[PDB]
Amino acid sequence: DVSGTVCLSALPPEATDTLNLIASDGPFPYSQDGVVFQNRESVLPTQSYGYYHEYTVITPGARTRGTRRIITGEATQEDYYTGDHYATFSLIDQTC
């Protein structure tokens, strides 16, 4: 399962961006947003279909989309941040 949560302060300034785009339901800059993620990686504490979504967090000097990616749930307070391209997953603690 997830390696635990990740204090929002522990995340980059481009990580909050997505959380703001999920909270403000856009508008999103990157093309990565407004899509489901049926935990096809089976790495996330899923169970149901359409209970997940993708929202890659922008990144500076990111030649590409960057291995970074946010994966939100169907319930607020469930935004996994790989940071290694669907490799790892650490929820986001906005409180932290």
- Sequence-separated (6 or more) residues with CB below 8 Å from residue 33: 18, 21, 26, 54, 55, 56
Structural domain harbouring 74: 1-96
The total domain count for the chain is: 1
Spatial distance between the Cα atoms of 96 and 93, rounded to a whole number of angstroms: 5
Question: Which domain CATH number covers 33?
Answer: 3.10.450.30
Could you tell me the two tokens for 21?
A: 């785009």
Tell me which residue has tokens 């980059």: 12
Pairing of strands 6-7, 92-93: parallel
Spatial distance between the Cα atoms of 29 and 21, rounded to a whole number of angstroms: 9
Whether 51 and 74 have beta carbons less than 8 Å apart is answered as yes
Could you tell me the two tokens for 26?
A: 């856009």
Could you tell me the two tokens for 43?
A: 């790495």
Please tell me the experimental approach by which this structure was elucidated: NMR
Q: Three-class SS string for 54-92?
A: ECCCCCCCCCCCCCCCEEEECCCCCCEECCCCCCCCCCE
Q: Just list the catalytic residues.
A: 54, 85
Burial 53-71 (b: 16+ CB within 10 A, else e): bbbbbbbeeeeeebebbbb
What is the Cα gyration radius of the chain? 12
